[PDB]
Amino acid sequence: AAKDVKFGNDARVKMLRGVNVLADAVKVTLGPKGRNVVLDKSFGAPTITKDGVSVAREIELEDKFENMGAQMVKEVASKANDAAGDGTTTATVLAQAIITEGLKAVAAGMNPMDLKRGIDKAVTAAVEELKALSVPCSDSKAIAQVGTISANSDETVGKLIAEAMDKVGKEGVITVEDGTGLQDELDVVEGMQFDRGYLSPYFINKPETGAVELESPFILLADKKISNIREMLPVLEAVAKAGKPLLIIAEDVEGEALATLVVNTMRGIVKVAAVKAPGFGDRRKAMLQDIATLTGGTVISEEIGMELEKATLEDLGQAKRVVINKDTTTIIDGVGEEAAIQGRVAQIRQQIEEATSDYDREKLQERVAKLAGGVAVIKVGAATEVEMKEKKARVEDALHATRAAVEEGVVAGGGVALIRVASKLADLRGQNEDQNVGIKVALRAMEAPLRQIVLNCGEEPSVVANTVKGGDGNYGYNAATEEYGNMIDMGILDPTKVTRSALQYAASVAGLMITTECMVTDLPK
Amino acid sequence: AAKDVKFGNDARVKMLRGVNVLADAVKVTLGPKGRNVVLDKSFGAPTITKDGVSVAREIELEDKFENMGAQMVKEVASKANDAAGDGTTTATVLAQAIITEGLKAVAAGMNPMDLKRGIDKAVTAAVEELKALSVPCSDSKAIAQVGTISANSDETVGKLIAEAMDKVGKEGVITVEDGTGLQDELDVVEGMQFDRGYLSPYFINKPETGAVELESPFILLADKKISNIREMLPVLEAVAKAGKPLLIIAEDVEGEALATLVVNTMRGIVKVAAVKAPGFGDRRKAMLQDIATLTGGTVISEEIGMELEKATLEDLGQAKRVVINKDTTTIIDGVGEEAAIQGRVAQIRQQIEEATSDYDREKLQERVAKLAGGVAVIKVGAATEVEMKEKKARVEDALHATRAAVEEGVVAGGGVALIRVASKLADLRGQNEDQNVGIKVALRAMEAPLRQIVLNCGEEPSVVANTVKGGDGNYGYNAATEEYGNMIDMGILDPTKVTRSALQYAASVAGLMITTECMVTDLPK
Amino acid sequence: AAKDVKFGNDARVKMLRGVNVLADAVKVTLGPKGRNVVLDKSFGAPTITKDGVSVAREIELEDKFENMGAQMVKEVASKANDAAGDGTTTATVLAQAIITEGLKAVAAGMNPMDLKRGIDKAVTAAVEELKALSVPCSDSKAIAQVGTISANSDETVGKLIAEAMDKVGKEGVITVEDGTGLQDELDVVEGMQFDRGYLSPYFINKPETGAVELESPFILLADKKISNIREMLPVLEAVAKAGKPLLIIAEDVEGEALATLVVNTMRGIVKVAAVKAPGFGDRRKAMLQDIATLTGGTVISEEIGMELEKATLEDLGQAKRVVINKDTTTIIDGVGEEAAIQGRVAQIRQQIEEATSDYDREKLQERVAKLAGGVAVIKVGAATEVEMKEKKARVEDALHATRAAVEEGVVAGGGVALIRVASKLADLRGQNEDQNVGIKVALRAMEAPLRQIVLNCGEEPSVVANTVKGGDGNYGYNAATEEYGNMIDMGILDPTKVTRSALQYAASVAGLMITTECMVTDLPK
Ligand SMILES: Nc1ncnc2c1ncn2[C@@H]1O[C@H](COP(=O)(O)OP(=O)(O)O)[C@@H](O)[C@H]1O
Ligand SMILES: Nc1ncnc2c1ncn2[C@@H]1O[C@H](COP(=O)(O)OP(=O)(O)O)[C@@H](O)[C@H]1O
Ligand SMILES: Nc1ncnc2c1ncn2[C@@H]1O[C@H](COP(=O)(O)OP(=O)(O)O)[C@@H](O)[C@H]1O
Ligand SMILES: [K+]
Ligand SMILES: [K+]
């Protein structure tokens, strides 16, 4: 189709007007007291909301260029949120500020590549300083406060997350499902999680999750290197006869076996998800034995001398749910008899007092954690199905945020540590003075988040910024209570990973667009 | 339909504006550091890319004339890439420069035929000087670096190509297929390749390949000159009963046999692809015997005294794939028993120590290479299907580039040998001073590739050109590291054939446009 | 439908603008070095061509009057080409020149009929002088050069035509069909050709040919005056039972016979094509006997005493193809046994040494030529089906041109003999001075073809014309090599009939439309 082609600033101002309008609409919702926005409905009384994601979903511009600039900004904010979990409106504010400044600098006739270099290395140095500032978010209080701020001040969600992880542990998995009545319920069910996932994304029947999700499956358990589908065909027929999804745990699947597995799956014959055998060596065989006991399955290992041709439904493990991540797989409610699982746990424990090696110490700790802690299952109790989905979404958002905080730490929330680092990295410079200017652009733009928080709360952005500058460390300004103090004390915990990802993706999009010189779109007809 | 007819400069400016806009959009991606271009998408997030091919795929103009001029330019760049393998954006820059200069010179009231003569003979002289500069690209390092630059800096692809060709050899074939897991695997399978292809393009069921591709076929092997389909009909029925594709390897197929073969193929009765018997004389019979052993087939030769009427499925050779090029056919995974193929290889080897003639020396070297080296089969391991296709297409592009470099050599990359030759052929002149002007046009425009590379990298085109002019030979400027040195050293290898084809097709299109005086299009309604 | 009606110059200027635009687009392709024209296509890559036929296929005008004027011009150029075989662009140049001159003369208030008279008698005198200049094109060299220039410099086509006619002869037919592989093959097959064709065009199932073409037909062979369908009804049923086309060769078919034959054919019962019996008298019966032997048929004559009711499929002749021209019929690959045909040939030869009369001498020469020379069948081998059709069209055009040159001779090509006659018939005058002006118009426009040839080659039209005028006879200017010399020697042969027909049809159209005073078209809505 005939195309409208733009070059340089022609496209750039076109992008930037849409970006700025998008963020002008979004940033009013930043902070605990974001400004009201009435998303118009097709019918009836429209919906009033106060979060950046809600409005960002409801935006389209007649100007195709402004619209697509908004589309890239929304895309990059989504990229951040995937690696952040919150700060979505904060990510939008950062994106607008850095994008607008970078486009204005590009229009100033100065080097775009140097802008990108300065911005990127400044972001790397800021990530390093945040990691230095990153204190480990491990305590149940900090986890509760992370689930609080992530779910827009919901303490109970983070508190229950901390309880579930304490009950089950990291070697297990916490899963969220539909609640029965109106109250959530947590169950430490018989499951496990090992750090081996699907060998091919072709097996993913739930592409949104990035993990194969099978309900009440048959679980083949192989401690062996597999090369041919001829050995596997009777098992495929057996599983297809009962109409259950199929999960393979093998030491290796190679060549024709995997090829015909892919062929049979794309034909829809069998729902097959094949993963690596956890660990290596004898530990792998023992862990397969734990799986076999928990799911009522059996280990198919050549050391037994038994072949895969004669593998049947009882031989294959049975669970109620399995989730096969990229390099991780978890079993939820293994159908295998629970007292048998207890006997296997006692077997692993007697193996524990037989071993003494610290490597073996931690490996057996992991095994007993997987088998006994099982899987945390959360059933969200809510009244209306719309509130059911709302609450569940809050729950997984807080869960992802708590994982990010555990793995990256939490800095003081409210945007005050940003002011701290601005007081710190005010001296950062690049190889070219253009890189210096990009660094200073970043320093300016990165105080904007707190500024917009205070603005939407109805108070003074820059005055709060200056007063925080007067302080140091966690000294800052609760924009909800609007009080100066230690943000950690009043529970405003923004994880290191959240702001880190938001800033990194904002830098990525700003640099990429700074280096953009032409574009092609469709004609406005 | 009523037509918009243009004459002379009326059509010419129409063409040239589209050409110039096309290249203005394309050339920003030239070099290792091409400029960002956001191709728009029909929905959601558009596509950010940095290569001229992708953007060339996404361009259409409302102006019919500018659009259609850009269509010829895209076509001619494709013609170059077919005979080049890369330099696509380089070919686009060359095409714009030469075409624009030639159109301006035509508009200058000056002889177009002389322009074409000057441009063409200058391009021929430049091809001669490039061949003089063409150093043989035969070593694994140079092949790896060709696969690197062709795939936009991908060393591993060229390195694996060098390994595969060392394992299999020239007399075999390297084939790329879908991988099973996430890592590629290379197999030296039992196949072969001889330099005889289809006698009629009608047999090509894969017109894009220019080669008949048959999967698990029946392979008739005839050492005889066929003339009638009456002898062939029982074989056709036998092959059609089993539903396999059919590949004839005959000394000759003539008259009624070929006619009714074409008729039956048009009716879709049998998938028949007939090829010449490799070589001539007794060597041909020996090679048919090698094929018969490798594919489990039999040689149908009149010297045995047996007739073709009694040819059946077991008699016909069996492979897993066959690819019949224009004058070349390769067999991939011959179903014939492998130890039998080994016995045949030992037979050819004992024939080797029976012979002593150098002609026979090399013929038997070729035979043993074909039979033992077989076919290299590469299964590209990738996660997502989109990245699967991306990686595979990179692989075949680098493969075509490596073949071109082997058959033509590599000159120093980055556009520095172009500056060398400009310093060299600055004295080239034509019979008419118009031909001289065309030659000087070529000399000017041919430094533009490096200029645009340095421009897109963000640095000075003409200053780099001058500094290279100060140097000689492989002295030049890495536009990625942006350093002056020997462009051969850091792997910047542009094959002789790539730039040769790009320049030749640019000259062809420029001369054709220079000689064009009128054109007819549809009315713009 | 409501009509736009134009009178006199109102229509005439409308006509002339379309004619002039058509020729302005076409004439750039005249000569061996015609200018490039890029026919813009609906999709993909447009088509670059250099011949007037291709561009003439690609023209339509929004102006209804100009469009339909160009439609008459294209029609008359087709009329010329049918009676010429080439000079299509030459005919277009002549048509534009004469029409434009005729219209500027009519607009001068001067007699149109006198213009017509002058033009027509000038064309007749020029035809007479061309025939005087016409040297017989009979040798294989001249035939090869005719097939060369006709196919735009293709020597091999004319050379193979000369070989085929030497092998088969005038009394046979040279047929061109699809080749099997990639090379053509010539076969002197058992056929014949006699100078009697269909008695009714109703029999023509191939109206484009003007000849009934029957594939593998049943050939009734009669030596009798037929009057009734009753005798043929059993034969019609016999032929319809086997589903073959039917060819009658009878001394005469009259009245109800032919009428109900037409009825049965229009009902589609039988594919009947009835022709005259060749010659008259006993020679006719003997020639029917030759047919009966060659096609395996039988002669149905009353001298035998046998009746037509009992005529069956074996009695009817069998061939593989028959082509029934207006007054000529040829048989290609008579199914009749070949050694039987040889016995019949020996029979005719012994008849030869029994006869002595020169009339009988040449009649028997013709008979033996028909029976032994048979039919030349050319199977054009080519790679692509598009190139197959291209080559077939080239071959048939060269064949028609060679026939025209054999029957009319060749004058020196390149347009130099036109300049010769302009030196010669400069003195031609008409009865009225208006007729004189028309004659001078013809003289002026007659040098225009060479002028346009030299123009498209990029050189001086009028200077070449003057230098040729300085010479005489075959002295002229090769516009490809651009050299002064003998056109006959350097292979540039333009047949007398080609230019004769082009000029005659140009004169016809010019005179007709000059005498046009009004016309009617549809309204432009
Ligand atoms: N008491 C508080 N004082 C100051 N800032 C807060 C407080 N509670 C939450 N915030 C910050 O305000 C933001 C709420 O904005 P919100 O509309 O949720 O956008 P996002 O979804 O991007 O976080 C959070 O990112 C959080 O860091
Ligand atoms: N390190 C380098 N220094 C200078 N030039 C390079 C370097 N690496 C690659 N190139 C050149 O840059 C070009 C990459 O441009 P690209 O967008 O791939 O266009 P194309 O597809 O036409 O090659 C290659 O043709 C290559 O010759
Ligand atoms: N070597 C030559 N020198 C001069 N004239 C030539 C030569 N070869 C061919 N011609 C003439 O040029 C014409 C080619 O024009 P072409 O595009 O084929 O138009 P047309 O199809 O009407 O002939 C021929 O008619 C032929 O008479
Ligand atoms: K909020
Ligand atoms: K590139």
Ligand SMILES: [K+]
């Ligand atoms: K021509």
Ligand SMILES: [Mg+2]
């Ligand atoms: Mg929030």
Ligand SMILES: [Mg+2]
């Ligand atoms: Mg490239």
Ligand SMILES: [Mg+2]
């Ligand atoms: Mg011609």
